[PDB]
Structure 1
Amino acid sequence: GKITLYEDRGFQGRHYECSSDHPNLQPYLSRCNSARVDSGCWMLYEQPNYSGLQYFLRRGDYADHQQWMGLSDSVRSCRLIPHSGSHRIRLYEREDYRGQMIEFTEDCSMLQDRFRFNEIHSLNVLEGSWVLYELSNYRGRQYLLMPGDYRRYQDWGATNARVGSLRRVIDFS
């Protein structure tokens, strides 16, 4: 799809349009305080090369970085998350796909209501892309998951295994 990132709030100031992954927005955008997501699902990153804090944006209007739960106006790379028509993920109690496992094909806002573990230590993203959230109801630190193996929580960019919720990356329109 396409996303337009603006240096000032309210879709004001200098801006830059992306249609694909961009690993270093720094020459083209000195800060980001609003965004318009016309189409697609996007992950914004605080640092270049898809690192630092992550923020999931779907289509729609974001007049402040707080509306994507952004903690600062730093946005220095972004990913266009490939569309998927189906979603399936396996979440594991322990590293390397060991221990008890819970499987999802739908969103889960309250992981601890379905799984009696505060942590997920590995997971397997069989179908579609997801966003994993530190806290229930899609809050806290966010980690983009794309199809593939995640043998350790460090493989999704986390410094611990805390998980409270997870959502499918779906374009709503």
Structure 2
Amino acid sequence: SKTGGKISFYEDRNFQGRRYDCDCDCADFRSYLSRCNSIRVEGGTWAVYERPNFSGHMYILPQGEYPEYQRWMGLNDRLGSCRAVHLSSGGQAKIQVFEKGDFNGQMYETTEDCPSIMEQFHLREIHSCKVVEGTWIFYELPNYRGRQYLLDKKEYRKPVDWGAASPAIQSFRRIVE
């Protein structure tokens, strides 16, 4: 009955050393593991953070096996908390973006991923956006690179409403499966 996603962290490379298995979000795993240099994802998609309380660098990990941290693009082997990412299906994911805050300025509507916002819409920044269909991720650098943020069916009127300290956004993609 306890069906769910599962991730395993190993203190040494090649899944060697002490191992820890988690089946739910954990705000502080420091008491069970002092470091993690490799990870195995058996099911589900998870977000890992460099420091406790989902803070510091954040990385999205889909199901799969990573015998070494570099295979997950980790900056180092420090991980203090992890959360399971829930995927929403339904039909066609839809997002709208506005040039000014409070949904003002020019508006653009799209149902597909965008690798470079400036190349597609000639926009250098985005100050408001309404996502209400499926889940969407935004990335600070083109080609889905840099810090990434998970967006749910929500209405964002200010850039800080996205947890971002600046209205800078260069690419976004829809999450499926």
TM-score tier after normalising by the smaller chain length: 0.7 to 0.9
Deviations along 1:125-158, one digit per CA (max 9) or x if unpaired, are 2122222111111111111222323333323332
- Could you say what the CA RMSD is over the residues aligned between the two structures, in angstroms? 2.1
Are residues 163 and 30 of structure 1, via their aligned partners in 2, closer, same or farther at CA, if it must alter by over 3 Å?
same
1:42 aligns to what? Answer: 46
Report SS of the residue matched to 1:27. Answer: coil
1:114 aligns to what? Answer: 120
Cα separation, 1, equivalents of 2:71 and 2:108: 31
Q: Which of 121, 131, 137 is the matching residue for 2:137?
A: 131
Report SS of the residue matched to 1:10. Answer: coil
8 Å CA contact 1:43, 1:144 repeated in 2: no
Cα separation, 1, equivalents of 2:13 and 2:160: 33
Letter in 2 for 1:32: C
Letter in 2 for 1:161: P
The answer to whether 1:55 aligns with 2:37 is: no
Shift of 1:55: 0.8
| Bigger shift: residues 27-36 or 149-158 | 149-158
Q: Which of 51, 72, 78 is the matching residue for 2:82?
A: 78
Report SS of the residue matched to 1:32. Answer: coil
Letter in 2 for 1:19: D
Deviations along 1:100-148, one digit per CA (max 9) or x if unpaired, are 2333333222222212112222222212222211111111111122232
Q: Which of 22, 26, 30 is the matching residue for 1:22?
A: 26
Calculate percent identity across the aligned residue pairs: 50
The answer to whether 1:9 aligns with 2:9 is: no
Shift of 1:84: 0.9
Report SS of the residue matched to 2:132. Answer: strand
Cα separation, 1, equivalents of 2:86 and 2:26: 14
Q: Which ranges of structure 1 fall in alignment gaps of 5 or more residues? A: none
Cα separation, 2, equivalents of 1:54 and 1:137: 17
Number of corresponding residues? 171
Larger radius of gyration: 2
Deviations along 1:22-44, one digit per CA (max 9) or x if unpaired, are 22222222222222222222111
Q: TM-score, normalised by structure 1?
A: 0.85
8 Å CA contact 1:131, 1:167 repeated in 2: yes
Letter in 1 for 2:151: L
1:152 aligns to what? Answer: 158
